[PDB]
Amino acid sequence: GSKDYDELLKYYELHETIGTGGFAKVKLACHILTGEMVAIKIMDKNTDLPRIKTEIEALKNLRHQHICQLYHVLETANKIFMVLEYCPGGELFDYIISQDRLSEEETRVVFRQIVSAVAYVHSQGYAHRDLKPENLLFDEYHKLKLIDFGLCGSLAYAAPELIQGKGSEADVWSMGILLYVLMCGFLPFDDDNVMALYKKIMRGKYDVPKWLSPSSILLLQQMLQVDPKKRISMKNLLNHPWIMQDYNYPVEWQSKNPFIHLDDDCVTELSVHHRNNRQTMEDLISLWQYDHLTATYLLLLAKKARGKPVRLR
């Protein structure tokens, strides 16, 4: 009887509704061809348009093993549907509060996935501008994926010039706020009034607790430079000693999930399902229109790395 869930329910089986906040709620669901669990961000357009499409059109052109992958895309008459990677681990935010502060070791593993994500985003020419621990999840395998692109509670991680409206280096500051929140358990510049914080952010003076490594403070000092030209570049960030402390080899920000290389095993299987020549489907898949076929393929080689047999229904 669903009037708007026509197309969706033809390709997915609905499950437990999550995310309820009027503006958007995410319901997990099962891709029936692949039997693979997905999350679907449901938004009606009665409660904006461009900010969302700026996120979706970004996500259309970025693929990376630490960005929450976007599959099919669907727009109803008064609704919009986005299916994305399954991220049951939850926010890194709650993961922070789970165990008070985070060890330098544990903070190092989380953070290097973050830089590899953000360093790849910058290669393609985008900046996320809104980096908060509420915007990065854990997949089924404790890998980290970033969401809520949108811009391409959110002021504390904002760079000084981002409040000045005066360009990728705003994230290097945001990641510096992240790391401080990671190893400790609190923010560099927070307080109850927004007026006082603007002052503290432009002032750039923040405390430094007991437990922090002499290697950390250096890195944060290079990251929390109100001078964006004196802020540390992404190039030096990928080779930095704190980042190469134990885990000792360059941050592999190179996307291992490509727009260019189509896995044969998945495309051979996909062609027998549609009754096409394999060469015919390969070019068709490379369109990446983010309709059903793209969802089927990208959850098929995902099913492959999952270890499952590469089958449909």
The single residue among 19, 150, 185, 204 that binds ligand 7LY, judged by CB under 6 A, is 19
The number of beta carbons lying within 10 Å of the beta carbon of residue 135 is 22
Is residue 39 a contact point for ligand 7LY (CB under 6 A)? yes
**Minimum CB–partner distance for residue 20 and ligand 7LY (Å):** 10
Burial class (CB in 10 A: 0-12, 13-18, 19+), 121: buried
The single residue among 9, 13, 17, 18 that binds ligand 7LY, judged by CB under 6 A, is 18
Count of residues touching ligand 7LY (by CB under 6 A) = 16
Nearer to ligand 7LY, 137 or 243 (CB): 137
Structure token digits, residue 121: 């985003």
Per-residue burial over 64-76, b if 16 or more Cβ lie within 10 Å, else e, is bbbbbbbbbbbeb
Q: Which is the catalytic residue, given 6, 130, 190, 263?
A: 130
Burial class (CB in 10 A: 0-12, 13-18, 19+), 246: exposed
**Minimum CB–partner distance for residue 225 and ligand 7LY (Å):** 31
Within 110-149, the residues that bind ligand 7LY by CB under 6 A are 137, 147-148
Is residue 295 a contact point for ligand 7LY (CB under 6 A)? no
Is residue 80 a contact point for ligand 7LY (CB under 6 A)? no
Q: Is 19 left (phi over 0), alpha (psi -120 to 50) or beta?
A: left
Q: Are 66 and 145 in contact (CB under 8 A)?
A: yes
Q: What is the DSSP secondary structure assignment for residue 240, as one 8-state letter?
A: -
Is residue 57 a contact point for ligand 7LY (CB under 6 A)? no
130 an active-site residue? yes
The reply, when asked if residue 89 is annotated as ligand binding, is no
d(CA 262, CA 7): 26
Sole window of 43-51, 86-94, 207-215, 290-298 interacting with ligand 7LY (rule: CB under 6 A): 86-94
Residues 9/13/14/15 CA torsion (nearest 10 deg):
180
Q: Which amino acid is at 111?
A: F
Is residue 84 a contact point for ligand 7LY (CB under 6 A)? yes
**Minimum CB–partner distance for residue 86 and ligand 7LY (Å):** 5
**Minimum CB–partner distance for residue 121 and ligand 7LY (Å):** 15
Q: Could you tell me which residues are annotated as the binding site for ATP? A: 18-26, 41
